[PDB]
Design a protein around this nucleic acid. Structure first.
Ligand SMILES: [Mg+2]
Ligand SMILES: [Mg+2]
Ligand SMILES: [Mg+2]
Ligand SMILES: [Mg+2]
Ligand SMILES: [Mg+2]
Ligand SMILES: [Mg+2]
Ligand SMILES: [Mg+2]
Ligand SMILES: [Mg+2]
Ligand SMILES: [Mg+2]
Ligand SMILES: [Mg+2]
Ligand SMILES: [Mg+2]
Ligand SMILES: [Mg+2]
Ligand SMILES: [Mg+2]
Ligand SMILES: [Mg+2]
Ligand SMILES: [Mg+2]
Ligand SMILES: [Mg+2]
Ligand SMILES: [Mg+2]
Ligand SMILES: [Mg+2]
Ligand SMILES: [Mg+2]
Ligand SMILES: [Mg+2]
Ligand SMILES: [Mg+2]
Ligand SMILES: [Mg+2]
Ligand SMILES: [Mg+2]
Ligand SMILES: [Mg+2]
Ligand SMILES: [Mg+2]
Ligand SMILES: [Mg+2]
Ligand SMILES: [Mg+2]
Ligand SMILES: [Mg+2]
Ligand SMILES: [Mg+2]
Ligand SMILES: [Mg+2]
Ligand SMILES: [Mg+2]
Ligand SMILES: [Mg+2]
Ligand SMILES: [Mg+2]
Ligand SMILES: [Mg+2]
Ligand SMILES: [Mg+2]
Ligand SMILES: [Mg+2]
Ligand SMILES: [Mg+2]
Ligand SMILES: [Mg+2]
Ligand SMILES: [Mg+2]
Ligand SMILES: [Mg+2]
Ligand SMILES: [Mg+2]
Ligand SMILES: [Mg+2]
Ligand SMILES: [Mg+2]
Ligand SMILES: [Zn+2]
Lengths: 53, 97, 137
RNA sequence: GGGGGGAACCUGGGGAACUGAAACAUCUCAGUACCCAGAGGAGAGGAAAGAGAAAUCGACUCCCUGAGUAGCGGCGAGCGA
RNA sequence: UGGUGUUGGCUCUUGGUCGCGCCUGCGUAGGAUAGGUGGGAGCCUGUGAACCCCCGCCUCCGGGUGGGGGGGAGGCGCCGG
RNA sequence: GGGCCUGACUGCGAGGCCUGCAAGCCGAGCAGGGGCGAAAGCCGGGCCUAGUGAACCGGUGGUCCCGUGUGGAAGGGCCAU
RNA sequence: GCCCGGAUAGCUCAGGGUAGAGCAGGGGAUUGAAAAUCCCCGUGUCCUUGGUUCGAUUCCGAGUCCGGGCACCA
């Protein structure tokens, strides 16, 4: 990473649990990430939100 | 500084501990001792002068036991104390502790 | 202040807190003006004035009230205060405490979700031209 | 009445370093060596403002066990009920 | 070098802050010194109005404001521009 | 180059490469819930091989496993980072 | 990591009703010149967005960036 390529987590947006960690380049991508992603807690796919690591 | 004439308190030995780091309760990695060393802690010795049977009698006393000196004078009432040199009066007073 | 008011002042005493019932028995003793005075209930919400979200506003349909039926609208002012008419000096005492209490209830029902302090920092009962009495809400 | 002496043993007051950590500072060596005071034939301790989970035990001391357990620890070296 | 003990008496000047009393708040249109709002068609006066005199005074200089001497029947609002 | 999308999955993992240890690497297949495709199928990031750092100590989010007589709490474990 | 903070025109700057001030630039006066002086003029979502108020750089929330402060680093 760097200061601009940054690490982050992905919180399931139904149960609010952080299920995945990844990285983005916050210049290239100021938008907080949204990714459908499978939540083991909910056991279904779910939209997940970028949430600070 | 020596010894409480009333209470017997005398200097104890203590360590001076020197720590760094941030306490764990504060989210810190923890405290680290950077030095331990012996030092002494002294009693708060002070002088208390009193007149008793017309003689001046002074005590070396822990500040904490200053009033116990006065109690002591107060109990010196029912005492035949005349003629006495200051040394032997004091003797008589601590005989009441 | 006028003799008429200076009089009433005696039947009060600031220190004392009073009770919803004790205050209801005084109201009548405090309404010495030539008309059916009201009563009013002044609070003092312990929330932040300059804001929103934590703004106290709404209505209450008092079981008796007004007599001028119910549904009074109340809204906290720029300061931390909120005021409202609870009835007219007439009303049997055991009729006001029913509204004072019914109104104060609504206030609590409209407390925010993000408010610091004891909310009802203070509460008072009064009449149009009379003095006032603190109360244990 | 004290005073001084006694091989070790004992209790109190004070109290190291080499060394170990394959460097070192916390830690270890160790409350050890040693210095001092005081006992005695022993000394200390001792009749619960205790233990600590059993609606339990019943002063203190000493041995065996519990146990290298429980824990303590630059969670290292080690320490240790 | 700060706090605190040993450490006491008398004054004078003060700030923080709890309470209560009480005034201070002036863009522009305007009776003119508009704090925010809710209440309120009446209330201030024999517990003495209207101006008159000393003024604690505050001021954006127009005024607000408060004790008392003169004081013995009219002032201040809904109106509504 | 374009369309749809988030498999830059969760739970595992036969079997190997490499190797003093610890590591490193490749992996078919099964289950869950998906994407794209008519389908056969493909997808557990990126043509490949560098872009990294054991443990200890501590942060944060979950979990609700322990909780020093009991209920709680303090603190800790476990999953994630 | 947490706490205090500044952002206003080209540079520097003070500020619930508002938008200006110093010298830089330009025009004019003056001068032998360089200045100094003097008169006019510009050069603004008052960092961003969202919210109060009738409205606001002014109050508040949220952001972004530099400024400062304290602490910690297995
Ligand atoms: Mg990942
Ligand atoms: Mg990326
Ligand atoms: Mg997924
Ligand atoms: Mg799970
Ligand atoms: Mg110290
Ligand atoms: Mg430590
Ligand atoms: Mg004391
Ligand atoms: Mg001897
Ligand atoms: Mg001897
Ligand atoms: Mg000893
Ligand atoms: Mg010794
Ligand atoms: Mg020495
Ligand atoms: Mg050493
Ligand atoms: Mg050494
Ligand atoms: Mg060594
Ligand atoms: Mg060595
Ligand atoms: Mg060396
Ligand atoms: Mg030791
Ligand atoms: Mg024997
Ligand atoms: Mg014996
Ligand atoms: Mg004994
Ligand atoms: Mg006994
Ligand atoms: Mg050790
Ligand atoms: Mg030891
Ligand atoms: Mg000092
Ligand atoms: Mg002092
Ligand atoms: Mg494509
Ligand atoms: Mg294998
Ligand atoms: Mg191997
Ligand atoms: Mg599948
Ligand atoms: Mg499929
Ligand atoms: Mg399909
Ligand atoms: Mg298929
Ligand atoms: Mg596969
Ligand atoms: Mg270590
Ligand atoms: Mg840890
Ligand atoms: Mg449990
Ligand atoms: Mg439990
Ligand atoms: Mg307990
Ligand atoms: Mg318990
Ligand atoms: Mg309980
Ligand atoms: Mg917990
Ligand atoms: Mg936890
Ligand atoms: Zn979920």
């Amino acid at each position: 990473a760097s200061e601009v390529r940054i690490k982050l987590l992905l919180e399931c947006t139904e149960c609010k649990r952080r299920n995945y960690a990844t990285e983005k380049n916050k210049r290239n991508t100021p938008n907080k990430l949204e990714l459908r992603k499978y939540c083991p807690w909910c056991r279904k796919h779910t939209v997940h939100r970028e949430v600070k690591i | 500084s020596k010894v409480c004439e009333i209470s017997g308190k005398r200097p104890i030995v203590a360590n001076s501990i020197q720590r760094r780091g941030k306490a764990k309760r504060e989210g810190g990695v923890g405290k680290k001792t950077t030095g331990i060393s012996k030092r002494r802690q002294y009693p708060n010795l002070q002088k208390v002068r009193v007149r008793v049977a017309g003689q001046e009698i002074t005590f070396r006393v822990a500040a904490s036991h200053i009033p116990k000196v006065y109690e002591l004078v107060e109990r010196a009432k029912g005492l035949k104390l005349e003629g006495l040199s200051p040394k032997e009066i004091k003797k008589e007073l601590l005989k009441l502790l | 202040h006028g003799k008429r008011y200076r009089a009433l002042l005696e039947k009060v005493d600031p220190n004392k807190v009073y009770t919803i019932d004790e205050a209801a028995r005084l109201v009548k003793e405090l309404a010495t003006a030539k008309f059916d005075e009201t009563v009013e209930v002044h609070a003092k919400l312990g929330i932040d004035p300059r804001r929103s979200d934590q703004n106290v506003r709404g209505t209450v349909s008092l079981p008796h009230g007004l007599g001028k039926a119910g549904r009074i609208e109340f809204r906290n002012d720029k300061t931390g205060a909120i005021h409202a008419p609870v009835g007219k000096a007439s009303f049997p005492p055991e009729k006001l405490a029913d509204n004072i209490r019914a109104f104060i209830r609504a206030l609590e029902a409209h407390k925010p979700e993000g408010a610091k302090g004891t909310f009802l920092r203070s509460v008072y009962v009064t009449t149009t031209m009379g003095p006032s009495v603190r109360i244990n809400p």
